[PDB]
C-alpha cells in the first residue's frame, strides 16, 4: 500500500544484464572448475533471461548431466525461452503471413506446450509489441475472445490456427 511505500526509500531492481550474469558465472566456474566454451555460456545466459537462479540452475544441470558446457549440451536439458518465438510469430501475424505463424505455432504445439500457456505468452507479447494502438486493441480483443473458448473447454490446434487467421484478418480489414 501507498502509506508503507511513503515510509521507505522504495528501491527498484532491474533485470540483470548479460555481463553481470557473466561475471558471477566466471566466479562460480572458477571455484567449481567447470570446463566450458563461450557459446555454451551464451546459451546459459539466453536460457536464464535475466534470472540468476535460472542461470545457476541451468549451469549446474548442464555440468551434472554432461560435464561440459557447449551449446547443444545446454539445449539438450534446458530449453529455448518461449516468448522469443512468440514475438516472431506475432510479427508474422502482423504482416498477414499465416504460413510462418502456423509454422511457429505448430513447432510450439509439438514441443508440448498447453494452449493456455501459448495464449498467455501471446497476450504478453501483444501487450508490449510495437504496432498501431487500434490494431493492438483489436488483437487483444481477439486474443480474449479465443481465450474464452480455451477456458470453456475447447482447446485444439484448430482454435489456435483460427486465432492466428483472425489476427491476420484484422490487419487486412481497416
Amino acid at each position: 500500500i501507498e502509506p508503507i511505500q511513503s515510509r521507505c526509500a522504495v528501491l527498484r531492481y532491474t533485470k540483470l544484464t548479460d555481463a553481470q550474469i557473466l561475471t558471477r558465472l566466471m566466479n562460480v566456474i572458477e571455484k567449481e572448475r567447470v570446463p566450458y566454451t563461450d557459446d555454451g555460456l551464451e546459451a546459459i545466459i539466453f536460457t536464464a533471461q535475466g534470472d540468476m537462479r535460472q542461470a545457476l540452475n541451468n549451469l549446474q544441470s548442464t555440468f551434472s548431466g554432461f560435464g561440459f558446457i557447449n551449446s547443444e549440451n545446454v539445449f539438450k536439458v534446458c530449453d529455448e525461452p518461449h516468448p522469443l518465438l512468440v514475438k516472431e510469430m506475432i510479427q508474422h501475424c502482423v504482416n498477414a503471413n499465416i504460413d510462418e505463424a502456423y509454422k511457429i505455432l505448430a513447432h510450439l504445439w509439438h514441443l508440448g506446450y498447453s494452449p493456455e500457456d501459448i495464449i498467455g505468452n501471446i497476450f504478453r507479447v501483444c501487450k508490449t509489441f510495437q504496432m498501431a494502438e487500434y490494431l493492438k486493441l483489436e488483437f487483444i480483443k481477439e486474443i480474449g475472445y479465443t481465450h474464452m473458448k480455451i477456458a470453456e473447454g475447447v482447446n485444439s490446434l484448430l482454435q489456435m490456427a483460427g486465432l492466428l487467421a483472425r489476427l491476420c484478418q484484422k490487419t487486412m480489414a481497416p
Binding site: 540452475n57 549446474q60 504460413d99 498467455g120 473458448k149 484448430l158 487467421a165
Partner: protein
C-alpha cells in the same frame, strides 16, 4: 501372480530405465541421484508423458521400502493443499529430521498448477530455507499456473511429447507380456492416434484387445471410431471436386455407414489443409471457418447443419482457387 488392473497402471515404469523418450533428462536426473545432489525439480509437459512415474521411480530408488513413509510426503490435488497445509504439515515435515535413518527428505507436489497463489507464495521460503534437509518436486501441466518465484527456485525439465520412434518398443514389451496379436499397421495406428501419450495408447490397446481380440488398423480405427486417412482424403476430394448436393450425399453416406463424428473429421481436415498448397487468403478463410464450426459443436447443436457448413467452407473457395489459376 495375476492382477485386475488397467494396463496404464499394471505396466508402470518403476525404474528410470523403463521410461523411453526423454533420455537426456533422465540421464541428468540419474546423475543427480548418483552424486547425491538432487535439486528442486519442476517437471512439466503434456499429459501421459511420464512425470509422475519419473518422480515415483526417483523416490523408490532414493529410499527403501522400510523407510519410505519417513521420507516422502506426497500431496496431490485429491488432498487439501491450502495455506494451512503449507504453514502446518509441510513446514513441519521440511523443518524436522528423520526418525529412522539419516538422509534428505522429499516433498512431491503432484498437480502443482491446481495450488492457490497463497500456498505457492507461502511455499517459497520453505523451499529456500530448508533446501539442505528436503527437496521439493513440482509436477504440473500448465506452467502459467505456477508463480515465477517458484519457477525460479526449481530447475525445470520439459517432459515433451513422446515421439513414436521410441514409443514402439514399450508397446512391444506390453504386447509380448500381454500375449497380443498385432500387425505393423496396428502399431502404426496406436502411435498415430496416441499423439505423444503412452496412457491413451495403452488404453486403446486394451480396449481393442477386449473388443476384437486382435490389433489391426481396421480394428483400432473401428474401436476408437477415428476415420482413416483415405476417407479423410476422399472427403477433401469430394469437397474440392464436386457440387454441393453430390458432395453432401457422399459425405453423409460415408458418415452414416462408418458412424463418424464431425470433431475428428474437422481435426484431420485441418491437418490436411496445411499440407495442401493453398493460397494465403484461402487458408485464412478456411481456418476461420473450421474454427467457427468446431466452436459450434461444443453445445446442443445439430451435426448435419455443421456438416453442411463444413462443405460450404470449401464450396465458397473452390471458385476463388480456380479463378486464381
Amino acid at each position: 501372480k495375476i492382477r485386475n488392473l488397467p494396463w496404464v497402471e499394471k505396466y508402470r515404469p518403476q525404474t528410470l530405465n523403463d521410461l523411453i523418450s526423454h533420455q537426456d533428462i533422465l540421464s541428468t536426473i540419474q546423475k543427480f541421484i548418483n552424486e547425491d545432489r538432487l535439486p528442486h525439480l519442476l517437471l512439466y509437459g503434456p499429459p501421459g508423458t511420464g512425470k509422475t512415474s519419473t518422480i515415483l521411480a526417483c523416490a523408490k530408488q532414493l529410499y527403501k521400502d522400510k523407510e519410505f513413509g519417513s521420507m516422502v510426503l506426497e500431496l496431490n490435488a485429491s488432498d487439501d493443499r491450502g495455506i494451512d497445509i503449507i504453514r502446518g504439515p509441510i513446514l513441519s515435515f521440511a523443518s524436522t529430521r528423520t526418525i529412522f535413518k539419516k538422509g534428505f527428505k522429499l516433498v512431491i507436489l503432484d498437480e502443482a498448477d491446481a495450488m492457490t497463489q497463497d500456498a505457492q507464495n507461502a511455499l517459497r521460503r520453505v523451499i529456500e530455507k530448508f533446501t539442505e534437509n528436503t527437496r521439493f518436486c513440482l509436477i504440473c501441466n500448465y506452467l502459467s499456473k505456477i508463480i515465477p518465484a517458484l519457477q525460479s527456485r526449481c530447475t525445470r525439465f520439459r517432459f515433451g511429447p513422446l515421439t513414436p520412434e521410441l514409443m514402439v518398443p514399450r508397446l512391444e514389451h506390453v504386447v509380448e507380456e500381454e500375449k497380443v496379436d498385432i500387425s505393423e499397421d496396428g502399431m502404426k495406428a496406436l502411435v498415430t492416434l496416441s499423439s505423444g501419450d503412452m496412457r491413451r495408447a495403452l488404453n486403446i490397446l486394451q480396449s481393442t484387445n477386449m473388443a476384437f481380440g486382435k490389433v489391426t488398423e481396421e480394428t483400432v480405427y473401428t474401436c476408437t471410431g477415428h476415420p482413416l486417412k483415405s476417407d479423410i482424403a476422399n472427403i477433401l476430394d469430394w469437397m474440392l471436386n464436386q457440387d454441393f448436393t453430390t458432395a453432401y450425399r457422399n459425405i453423409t453416406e460415408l458418415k452414416t455407414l462408418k458412424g463418424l463424428a464431425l470433431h475428428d473429421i474437422l481435426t484431420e481436415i485441418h491437418l490436411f489443409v496445411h499440407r495442401v498448397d493453398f493460397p494465403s487468403s484461402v487458408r485464412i478463410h478456411l481456418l476461420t471457418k473450421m474454427a467457427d464450426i468446431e466452436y459450434r459443436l461444443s453445445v446442443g447443436t445439430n451435426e448435419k447443419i455443421q456438416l453442411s457448413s463444413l462443405i460450404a467452407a470449401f464450396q465458397v473457395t473452390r471458385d476463388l482457387i480456380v479463378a486464381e489459376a
